[PDB]
Amino acid sequence: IVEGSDAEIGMSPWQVMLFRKSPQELLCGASLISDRWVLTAAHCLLYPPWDKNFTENDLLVRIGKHSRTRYERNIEKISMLEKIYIHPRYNWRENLDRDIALMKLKKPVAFSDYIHPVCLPDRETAASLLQAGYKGRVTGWGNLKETWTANVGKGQPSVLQVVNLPIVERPVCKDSTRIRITDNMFCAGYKPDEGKRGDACEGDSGGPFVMKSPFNNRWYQMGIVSWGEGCDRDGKYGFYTHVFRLKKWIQKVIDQFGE
């Protein structure tokens, strides 16, 4: 996250860290959507141009965290993966269309003050909230800026970062890039005019873009950090998988293969 701030404790209890077993490294963000299901970006699991093709066994999921590196004794919970489900129409070749994947945990996770699922929007809620100029919130342990020295320890936060960003009109999104945008995506971020800044960055993928309903006081996950060009550049915007447009695939996977 670029130009965000330190999360408060328990601010995103649905935040999940997706972690590579060997070597031991942060891979991506993710979100907890029930006691047994975690949502993330497909490209975190499968991206052939970077030689990425993980199975269930390469990965851990870590829930309840605040610190990026410290094992948070008695706070965080670590689950193993039963099964990964990547969207069958995920397009890694061109533009990461349908950049979405579900991970089933081997055992349900016990909720706590630090661990708690986010809601997925119904049709009404999507339409009401997914409007240009409305702000959502993005969270992650990814890089604090576009990195120009190949590798740094100064690029990384010690604790979970948060930033609020406005949703942007589809024409502005479309003109800001030559990558082909789809209805399975939306973009967010300040315009160069608006003076304020912020973006997600590399490492934040799979993390949620959430909005608080002014009707029922609940947090809904409207997006998944998916892609961008650089981070926090003027005239660029962060791209997010559009969660509601893919909800039928999400329901289908959870109903069919579901405990």
Binding site: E8, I9, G10, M11, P13, S112, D113, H116, P117, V118, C119, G133, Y134, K135, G136, R137, V162, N164, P166, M211, K212, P214, N217, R218, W219, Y220
Partner: peptide
């Protein structure tokens, strides 16, 4: 507590607001 999705134990369930959630709610007006 049953389908209490999206309500944080340390915030909404305690009637505490986080430091920036005000900003999001203001965006629905302006």
């Amino acid at each position: 507590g049953e389908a209490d999705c999206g309500l944080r134990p340390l915030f909404e369930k305690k009637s505490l607001e986080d430091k920036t959630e005000r900003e999001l709610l203001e965006s629905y007006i302006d």
